Structures are given as C-alpha cells and as structure tokens.
Amino acid sequence: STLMKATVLMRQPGRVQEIVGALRKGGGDRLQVISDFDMTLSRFAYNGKRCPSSYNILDNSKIISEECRKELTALLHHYYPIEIDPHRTVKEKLPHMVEWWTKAHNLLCQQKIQKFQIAQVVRESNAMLREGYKTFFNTLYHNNIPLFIFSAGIGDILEEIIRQMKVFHPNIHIVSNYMDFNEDGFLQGFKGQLIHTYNKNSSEGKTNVILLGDSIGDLTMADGVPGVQNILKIGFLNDKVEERRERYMDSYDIVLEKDETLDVVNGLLQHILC
Ligand SMILES: Nc1nc(O)c2c(n1)[nH]c[n+]2Cc1ccc(F)c(F)c1
Ligand SMILES: [Mg+2]
C-alpha cells in the first residue's frame, strides 16, 4: 500500500517486492540506511521556489564576501561542465573534482569565518528538509538503525540543519567535509579526507541496505560496504523528469517523481521494522 502512492515508479515491481521481503525478514538488526543529503533529505522545492543546497546556504550568507562569492561562482562556471559531462569517465573527472573542491575549500579558509557563525547562517537560511523528516529520523533512531549521510558539501552546515530541526540523533553519521577551526574559533582548514561529488562512498552484520539519492551518481554510495546481501535503491526524481526518468527507473529500484516527502521511505521502514 505504501508503494501505491502516485509519485512511485518501479521498473520491476515484483523485484522490489522480493527485496522489501528480504529486508523485512532481516529486521532492523541487519539494516542500515545510506543517504545523500542535498535534494534527497533536504527538500527540492517549496512554495514555488527552489530550496537552497548546503553550498548555497553558506555561500549566500552574510559571512562570505561578495568577492568570494564571485570567485566561487567562477570556479563553478569552469568546473560544472566538466562535472556533468557524460563523455568524461568518472576516472577522468576525478582530478578536476579534487582541484575544484580544493580551490573552493581554500577560498573559504581565506575568509574570516568563525565557528559560532555557522549556526547563525543556518538559522537565517531558507534550509528545509523533506516533509516527513521527523518520522524518518525518529524511526531510525528509535529502531537503532544507523543512518550514513553522504555529502560533498560542508559537514558543519548539514549538522546544524538537522540539529536546528531537532532531529540530530546519535544514530546519524555524516560523511562529508568538516571545518577545522583555530583556538580563536576561525576557520583554518578542513578535516580528514576530501569528499567531492565523485567519491561519495565507503572510501558489523548490517548486510541489508536502503540507499536514498536524487542524482544518478548517488547509485554508488553503498559500493564498498562489505558483504551486502540485499540493497534497495530509492531515487528522488526532482526535475528534468522527461529527460531523466528512463535512466532513473532503469537503475533505482523505486523512483519517486516530484515527491517532496519521505512518506514512501517512511512507510517502507515501518513495514520492515514492524
Ligand atoms: N560552500 C562551498 N561552496 C562551494 O562552491 C564549494 C564548496 N563549499 N565545496 C566545494 N565547492 C565547489 C562546488 C562543488 C559542487 C557544487 F554543486 C557546487 F555548487 C560548488
Ligand atoms: Mg543530492
């Protein structure tokens, strides 16, 4: 019944039925959720307007100068055509993506950004999560299901969004780029491994996976999780739907077309965990 919502597309509904059945048989003990952030857990559009990405939330804020905003936009102008070019292989795109993210991160480090300002920028932003986010985050937490959120954005921004929406629970594990601040609270670098849009993947018995994404690249987020026995991939198809629908349906198990809610995922979780 969950899958009878009007936004639901399935190329092989019988296969979806078998995967959901295996997930239910395995129970929450075997389940983990692997999800993209922007335009998957965050809402795509509201009240006739696009909702901001994590990148937009910081870049359009009061703590980024207009000159820095122009330089970030110039980097985007150069690298976006490379990023989306289907005739460049993922391997050929990698060094360009590393360059772009390294350059953007360094520009942010050359501003005067203070830790306390991150909460402020998010609070003043138009950040929005999909409808049903409380049920989604609470169901996972109450059922002890780890949620891995991958984002090539800024971890601090993601965390403040989820915290300010009152759903940042200890079962959430964000894999993203976290800021490093000096003793005076000023941004000085980024922590750990660089995550760009083409290395959002894993690079305990939780062998069943629900993957949530909104781009064709998100299909790989669970690659490299060892010993996965069952995976159900759910893809939000937010825009350019006539152009994208076939490729989405042919790779994602379930596609949700212009669905600004987590209702289908929530219903699947309730079915699997009850
Ligand atoms: N705040 C911020 N601003 C940027 O421009 C950043 C960033 N963080 N990290 C990496 N880039 C470059 C980039 C990569 C993908 C995008 F979709 C995009 F809009 C911008
Ligand atoms: Mg996304």
Residue numbers in the entry: 6 to 208, 220 to 290
Paper text:
5’-Cytosolic nucleotidase IIIB (cN-IIIB) is one of the most recently discovered 5’-nucleotidases and has several unique structural and functional features. However, one of the most preferred cN-IIIB substrates is m7GMP, for which the activity of dephosphorylation is characterized by one order of magnitude lower KM constant compared to the other preferred substrates, whereas kcat/KM is comparable. The crystal structure of cN-IIIB consists of two distinct domains: the globular core domain (residues 1–51, 132–182, and 215–300) and the smaller CAP domain (52–131 and 183–214). The core domain is a haloacid dehalogenase domain (HAD).
Compound 5d’ is a decomposition product of 3,4-diFBn7GMP readily formed under crystallization conditions. The guanine moiety participates in additional water-mediated interactions with a side chain of His 100 and backbone carbonyl of Ala157. The 3,4-difluorobenzyl moiety stacks in centered-parallel orientation between Trp105 and Tyr60, while the guanine ring is in edge-to-face stacking contact with Tyr60. In the complex structure of cN-IIIB • Mg2+ with 5d’ solved with 1.56 Å resolution, two additional electron densities were observed. The first one with tetrahedral shape belonged to the phosphate group, while an extensive analysis of the shape of second electron density revealed the structure of D-ribulose, which is likely formed during decomposition of 5d. The distance of < 1.5 Å between D-ribulose and oxygen of Glu88 carboxylic group indicates a covalent linkage between the molecules. Significant movement under ligand binding is also visible for the sidechain of Glu88, which forms hydrogen bonds to ribose moiety in 5d or covalent link to D-ribulose in the case of 5d’.
